[PDB]
Symmetry: C5
């Protein structure tokens, strides 16, 4: 489009930085922020069948909308890159995580003109999950829950992205492991409930 | 009230109010009474136990609550609670006497402030400890004791009191651990110029068999 | 010119000028053409190679140049170039897709800004990758392919150019490494599109 | 006095006064005398002793006290002392000469300031050292010597001294450690040099320990 | 003069003067001539050595000095030197060409500034290098060569210059012992000045 007008872009960043409240949930019309999450698996590095611990690399594709960040893009760029400190991101956490997320990519989000925000960092992290079955035909099934840490369902709703296929599409052919199946469903932990996305990852050692 | 809880402007004003009254470095001491801090550990995972060196590597949710009345607001027609970055608030300077590594916070550092002045902060922590691991293979199991207390504030300034005194822990403990939990007991204890209050947390566990 | 290179106050003023003009978070897109970024990997060392898990641990110099002509100045009687802290300038958000650890930067985070608007940033980096190491014992060696692109900017926004392939490397590679380089190959490639430079390192053990 | 310790507005106002007087980067030399810094190490654990490479990994409470009287206030009806983030205070630049890892601080970084201008900062620290490890498995035990002094300030500027209570630390150290401690001594020492024409004061700490059996 | 070293207000004011005139991000070239930086490595310990992978883990005090005359003051009745956080000061962007890990700094990061404009910064560093360890178990030992110079400033802008067996500082408890340390100038190619430090050392026993 006009995507390459430096001044247009600098002005958009300015508008965003002035409207954006990095610490307040972008609720609209008094309804929960609808965040969407999807893990896209990239690698499985170490698996310990005795301790039941896995070390994985995945794209943590996250999206939501903040309509106040929107702008007329008839003759201005349709989207820009924004550093995540200038923005609100949802406070996601892996319930069965046993190491800090190690973010391997630049910490930038895209804000689209309609007001949609997308953050997709590439993350390496260790989890605690059922590893039993990893050396058989039918493999192991390790389950990861990603939800809001401090915000309950009425404040934030965490759903899976429309597309869960291609989940294993960018998975490294040089892993000692192979993905048999991935499912990504809604779930709610528990007076207040926290929504999360349960990722079931069915994988096996390459025989 | 629930009706007005997702009003963004209201949420932003509460954040502003709190950042104005909040003294992150001063204890929220009230009426010349010690700040009463409730600490409760909910164990999530036991990862690496060593029977020789007597060390363990645990993961627990540190449920911490206390009250700052001065952060209170009316809450009838605004949401009662909000998330606040903890750098904006006073949090107690708890430490574990027998920790042998830094606590690794695995969750976003956010507290919840309630309209009545109550502050709730519950990080997930992975930390190593020095404690009694002997008898871990045996049916009745090792009993590792963790002592968590205020680090610079003596007992006339901060009091620590544990909210759940006994349980199985069944709710939160990973079913995929090598270990099982028999009992968790938490007692208010004390150690002394002046006095420091703590919570002795006794984790009774054994290797599954 | 070269004779006024060491004039201290002339340097202070260029820095000041740069800091007043530079927009560290906006792509320096000139004349509605995507920022053309030059990348060259110049291998220094291979530290550890794992044939079981197919991970490799490498030390390289990431030679990176691009142009921001709004940063240019008249050097008739002032220095030709200066060093700027990387926080004062915009920097391409490059990422390695098959990276499995955070890029550990071994050098000072200083760039060079040339009086014509050229920015040169070349950090020394250590980083682990997941790549095909089968054959590293073998005389014809293994070939590890590292794919580096801009993480958030598509092709109309940022374009990657790699020079030169395959000419390096024998110049900077450690003679004391257990490994030796047979060849290096740096090629353009793409995937709206994300341009990237695929680097192919042909190496083998010594015997 | 002690009956006003939980006066919040007093504590807050004392913090205000301290942050206004305090020069975090300037040594608190009163009356052209060196700052008298007291250090004492109180050992909590020994975790890894490497017989091959002569390395120890230890956990100790590094007890540090000094005086800065400009920060002093009246104790007449404000709290005797308060806690302060160390970024608000000057802290002496202690280093261990035989440290081979960075100091890993296990505790909150708050110091205590007393109404008479006394400042105490006691972090729990886990750190690796390079010292003689031979004997660890014998009756007599190994003896590792740790020197802690000021890195940049010479003896005219800062004096480093051991503390009046020097039994410590024997009692605290965990009963669960593989090791046990035979003796601890903390003697004042003073290294001079060809590098620099001035003398750096320090405390030499001698830790005598053996494996249990 | 020493007499007034411990005047606190004199100290605070010197530090105020330094921070007011110091330009942390600009080379203190004087009189159209390159900054002359003094570098000397003082070996303290050698921890891990791998003759197979040719890798070495060392601890050394890095002595670094240079001049910025604009920092000079009149010390007639004030302190001769004071300590300054390096974030208030320009420091040379030195890098080890053959290093394979970040320099882990173990000491507090302060410089000393002398009333005549001399700046001394000497941090203790544990770093790992990629160097020839062949022949370490032998009586003549390995010779490991480390190369340090300005990472972004060519010769025209910064010169580095050397200034032993390091018996003074080296650990008696190291598995290893030092035969000889030599420090010589070298250039690499516009060109960069560096100091080659050659460490010659063997196993003990
Ligand atoms: C059956 C699901 C397995 C996962 C175990 C979760 C049990 C407890 N559920 C919670 C509690 C909180 C929580 C965190 C912090 C608070 O205060 C800051 C309050 C609640 N947050 C989430 N996402 N799940
Ligand atoms: C036996 C001799 C060993 C010498 C081998 C090293 C050759 C590499 N040359 C360089 C390049 C740069 C450099 C760094 C950054 C730039 O732009 C940001 C430009 C050049 N800096 C130095 N000190 N040596
Ligand atoms: C034939 C070899 C394929 C290997 C690489 C596969 C390319 C995958 N696609 C993407 C997506 C994004 C992306 C990143 C962040 C976003 O939002 C913040 C959106 C897209 N960025 C890049 N460079 N490639
Ligand atoms: C295994 C360890 C043996 C090492 C022996 C220790 C010798 C003591 N020498 C010094 C020098 C300096 C010093 C530091 C920086 C300077 O300028 C910035 C000058 C001197 N500071 C102290 N505390 N001890
Ligand atoms: C292996 C575990 C050993 C446990 C022994 C318990 C001894 C209690 N000692 C202290 C000292 C301080 C303390 C810390 C810092 C100070 O000044 C900054 C003052 C006192 N605080 C507490 N809660 N207990
Ligand atoms: C935005 O601005 C254009 C240009 O004037 C205008 O025609 C258009 O109606 C606006 N777009 C929307 C969706 O309102
Ligand atoms: C606000 O709070 C007070 C309680 O102090 C209550 O009387 C009042 O009705 C509430 N009304 C509001 C804010 O509408
Ligand atoms: C650059 O500056 C010099 C010296 O003033 C001048 O002679 C020359 O014409 C200038 N060039 C431009 C493009 O301004
Ligand atoms: C402290 O204030 C009291 C009154 O509470 C006064 O009597 C006393 O003289 C004061 N002391 C100092 C140090 O000024
Ligand atoms: C500063 O130093 C010069 C040295 O010649 C001397 O003339 C002058 O009196 C000094 N100033 C002070 C503070 O006395």
């Amino acid at each position: 489009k006009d995507d390459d007008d430096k001044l247009d872009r600098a002005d958009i960043l300015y508008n965003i930085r002035q409207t954006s409240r990095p610490d307040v949930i972008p609720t609209q019309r008094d309804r929960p922020v609808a965040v969407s999450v999807s893990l896209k698996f990239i690698n499985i590095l170490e698996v310990n069948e005795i301790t039941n611990e896995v070390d994985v690399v995945f794209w943590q594709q996250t999206t939501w909308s903040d309509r106040t960040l929107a702008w007329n893009s008839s003759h201005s760029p349709d989207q820009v890159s924004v550093p995540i400190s200038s923005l609100w991101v949802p406070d996601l956490a892996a319930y069965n995580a046993i190491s800090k997320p190690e973010v391997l990519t630049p910490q930038l989000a895209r804000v689209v003109s309609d007001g949609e925000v997308l953050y997709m960092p590439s993350i390496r992290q260790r989890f605690s999950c059922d590893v039993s079955g990893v050396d058989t035909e039918s493999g192991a099934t390790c389950r990861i829950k990603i939800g809001s840490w401090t915000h309950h369902s009425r404040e934030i709703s965490v759903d899976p992205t429309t597309e869960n296929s291609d989940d294993s599409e960018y998975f490294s052919q040089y892993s000692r492991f192979e993905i048999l199946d991935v499912t990504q469903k809604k779930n709610s932990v528990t007076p207040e409930a926290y929504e999360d996305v349960e990722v079931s990852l069915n994988f096996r050692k390459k025989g």
